Each structure stands twice: as structure tokens, then as C-alpha cells.
Subunit: 139 residues, 4 copies
Amino acid sequence: ARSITMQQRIEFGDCDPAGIVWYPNYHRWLDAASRNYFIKCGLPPWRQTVVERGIVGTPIVSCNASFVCTASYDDVLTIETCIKEWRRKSFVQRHSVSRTTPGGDVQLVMRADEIRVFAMNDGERLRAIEVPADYIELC
Amino acid sequence: ARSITMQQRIEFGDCDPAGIVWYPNYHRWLDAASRNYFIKCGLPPWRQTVVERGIVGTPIVSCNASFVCTASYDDVLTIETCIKEWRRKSFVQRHSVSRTTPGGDVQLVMRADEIRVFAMNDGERLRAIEVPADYIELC
Amino acid sequence: ARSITMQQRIEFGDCDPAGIVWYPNYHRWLDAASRNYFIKCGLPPWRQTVVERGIVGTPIVSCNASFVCTASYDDVLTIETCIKEWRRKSFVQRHSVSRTTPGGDVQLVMRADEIRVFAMNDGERLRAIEVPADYIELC
Amino acid sequence: ARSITMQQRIEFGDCDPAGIVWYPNYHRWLDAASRNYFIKCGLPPWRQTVVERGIVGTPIVSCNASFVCTASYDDVLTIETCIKEWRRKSFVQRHSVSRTTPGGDVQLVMRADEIRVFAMNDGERLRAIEVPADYIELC
């Protein structure tokens, strides 16, 4: 499993007065999508990991997104996520989001590349670490 | 200090397609208001407390709210908070929210009573505790 | 259909530093649950209604909630919603939320009564209306 | 006024179980910051504009962000926003976010470039328009 799919329904509250999905919401869903990818890959919840290995998760370091089409309540999004590239202590997470309107229309809604890292609590702040080998294996 | 005031500006994203503040947002602001009350009263951040006393904060157990008027972006809210009643291991937090429209109109927007408790991590889950005497003193 | 069920997975971002679902989030899900109830009952989206009848939705006027147990990421919630009582221009929406932990534990997480109304844009602000007879029929 | 400053306090609910600001929240604040820039520049609220000109706001088309440091509750952020470049029917909005910890520490927290456009409701969906000349004037 390298490419993982996730669905998300858009609710009324997820939209602005303009009637379209309020942008920041897409980041919420990609965050979920990211996390959903490792779990679906076999990784253990951050809950275990945080005690087992001391890994608190995968904070974001950078990201690039392009929105090409609008979306609104009732529409369902399909999120496709895969690991684009592995670096030394960070990886490139790719997400392609498509919108399915009522009446089955399907348009690409957004694309985003998220650069994240495995991290742990290092005294005061968080510290990145080399991606564990069982994680690269799993993914 | 028994009655604490807090302001909050309403943003565009805080509103629904209907053009008014999306309800759940008010809970976000009251949460902040609650917390802002103890801090303004003298309590130390949960950060310290959590190590000093082991108090993780004040989870909500119950609440009752009435919305009487709408609100929208650009409007500023004034939040008034005080401790209505102290029980044995819980307290009644009262919030009165007023809206000031552009053009200086002022209407009561909402009223809410939040029943909360001081809590700590008790092994698996959170546990309530008797309100510390220096907290009753402070408030 | 008088009692409607809805599931909701809890994500990492939906939790606070304390590790439990941040309260305001439950209101987000009940909002969705409310809306999901009419749709599942047969009502048309607010989108149509807003043009057909001019109904913008069902704003909340009051609500009472009790939280009895905590919840965290990975847990799945089951939301049960029904119309408790119909008044003249408002109704009582009842929600019972249960949490299913990993390891299949099932505890009631929260209960809430939301008093809402059918509304329309009345010039400056929103106005309530008598619940349409085809809505009472449907529900 | 080309460079506009905005402050934002971080609340407890704005953080994840890991104890740091949950990422998607930064987008919420930049959205506010963006909007705050035009208003502070002289533009009229979207409310007026939407009737006066029919401009619904400035949807985002693209964006690039880099997070360099963490942030947590109690910390105050300073947001600096300016228009980097004007294109034909779109502009480049630049945001530099700095964190001020308790104890007056000051670190750059994040940087982001948001590519947005002036838009209007074009029948079914939104349409971009040439940036009005009084807006370029104002900014």
C-alpha cells in the first residue's frame, strides 16, 4: 500500500458565507489523511508509539498546495495520499483531492505536497528523527 | 475580581453560508473565556499546574445555553464571565455574551452556564478534585 | 424514521493537549447530526429549500448538554438523533452520543437537547417560522 | 500602508495532544490576516462590496508555507502581511509569523505566500476578476 484513499463529506458548517468550503478546512482533512495513511499502512497509533518509541507524530515543516476548483456542502471528497519521497529525516507526503458533486460530477479540487518529519519530544521542544526502518518497510 | 471581561472579533471564516456565526464557534470562545477567567484571577497556566499540582485543567460536565440574537463577521463580542456557584468538586461558570454591531448597536447575544471541574489524570482517565483552596481564594 | 444514527471518527486534531476531545468539537458533530437527520428523513438540501421555500436552515435557540465520559482520537462515536417534541415554530432535537474505544468498549459519552427553529431571512435578520407540514410529515 | 501587523493569542483548544499549535489553525489566522489587511488598507467589508461591486472576497488559488519553529498556548503571535506582487487578476499575499513566548522569547514561526484573487459569483461558480484600480490604489 503506497497510495491510500480517504473520503470526507463536507458539512454546512465547513463552508463560509460565500457558500464554499472555507480553505483552512482542507488542511484539517489532509492532516487526517496523512495520519490515516500510516495507520492504514500498519503503523501503530501515536498513542503506543509515544510510549514504545517516544514518537509524538509527524509535524509539518513545509507544504505547497494549489486549489483549482470550489467545493460545497453535501459534496464528498476523495483524498488520495502516498509518500512521494523519502529524505533522511523527513518525507514528502502527496495529496490529490477530488470533489464529487451531487449529480456525480467529478473534478480535481486540490493538490498538495506536505513535507513532514517523524518527531519526538526533545526536552523543551520537538526533535526530528531518522525515519524508522520498520516505517519505511511498512509504507 | 469575580466578573471578567473578554473581547472577541468575529471573522469571516467563523460564519456559515447563512452569513451568521456558526454556533459551535461560540463554544470555542467560551472555552477561551473560561480559561481567561482563572488566569486573570491569578491562577498559573495549566502548564505549571500540571506539574506543580498535576491539574490538567477544568473539563466541562454540563452546560446550558440560550441564544437570543444573531451575530456576523466584523462584529465584536464582549464576554462577561464569573463564578456563579461553588459546589464540592465542581463550580458553575456563567457567561453572558453581548454583540456590538457596526454602527454601535448592542444586543445580548447569548447566555450560558457551564458546569466544570478541576481535574487530573487518574491512570486511565481524568478525575475531579476538590477545588483547591488557593483557587477559591484567588477567584 | 424518527431516530437517526450517525458515526463520526475522532481525529488527532480534534483533541486538546490534555489528550481528550476538545468540547466545542462535539457541537460541530451534533450540528452535522442535526442536519443529517432531516436529509435522512427526506428533506431537500438547504440549497434547494432556500430557493424553493426560502428556508435557510434551523438555527439553534437553546440547548442543554451533559458530558458523562471522555473520548479521544481513534475512538468512533455513534450519534443517535430524533425529534423529541414539536412546538409551534420550534422543535426539540435530542442527541445521545456513545463512544466505542479500541477494544470495543462502549460508554455513553454525551447527551444533549437542542432547541431549534426553521428560519428564513427576514430583511435584516433571520425569522422563525411554523414548521412546514411536509416536514412534520417526513419526520 | 503596505505592511500590516496583526496579533493573535494562542488558546488551549488551538493545540493538539502533542501540546503544540495544531497546523490547520495557522491557516485560520492567516485567512483573518489577509482580510484584515484590506480592511486596514481602506477597503469596505465584503458585505458592502458584495452588493456594491458584487465582489465576494479573495479565494485562495495557491500557497506555499514553511514552518520553522513550534508554538503553544499562551504564546502570542505577531502576523505581518503585505502584498508582494500584483499580477493581472491575482496577487501574491505574503505573511511572516513570529512567536513571542512567555519570558519574551521571539522566534520566527512561519512564513507563507498565498496567491489569491478577487472573485465574484459567476452563475454556478466563482469567477476572478481584474483587481479593481481603487484597490491597487488603496493598498
